[PDB]
């Protein structure tokens, strides 16, 4: 309930209002992703996860509950993601890479050579559900 004393990260400072900054950034992201073509994979994913995060920030007032439900970092690590996504959307708009070439071809190599168990392998835990929900949204 009380304000966050520290974020635990040097350089990252606690924002006194995080439900008021995240909501505005998500609204801007949703209003500025429109210029991307509708049938592009980037737009669908960005307009899916931004929509969920905007909703979640809308229902619940306190930042602790927002951190619990999203379960992906602190709100101060979400504000920076929202700002970076806005920047990326701008750079996508100016670059305009949406044009699929007529002579496009891609070699999708699928190697299955196993590796030992003791070799260092990056094994994360399960992602939050939206990371998959956006995935089926993209596939469909």
């Amino acid at each position: 309930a009380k304000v966050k004393q520290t974020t635990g990260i040097v350089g990252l400072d606690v924002v006194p209002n995080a439900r008021a900054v995240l909501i505005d950034l998500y609204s801007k992201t949703l209003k500025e992703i429109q210029a991307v073509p509708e049938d592009e994979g980037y737009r669908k994913a960005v307009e899916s996860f931004t929509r969920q995060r905007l909703n979640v920030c809308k229902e619940e007032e306190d930042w602790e509950m927002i951190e619990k439900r999203l379960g992906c970092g602190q709100v101060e690590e979400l504000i920076e993601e929202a700002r970076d996504e806005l920047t990326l959307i701008g750079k996508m708009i100016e670059w305009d890479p949406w044009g699929v070439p007529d002579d496009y071809e891609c070699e999708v190599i699928e190697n299955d050579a196993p590796i030992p168990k003791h070799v260092p392998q990056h094994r994360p835990g399960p992602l939050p559900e939206q990371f998959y929900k956006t995935l089926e949204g993209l596939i469909a």
Partner: peptide, 10 residues
């Protein structure tokens, strides 16, 4: 190896 090649596929 499954080195299949994609195409625009209209």
């Amino acid at each position: 190896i499954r080195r299949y090649v994609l195409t625009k596929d209209n």
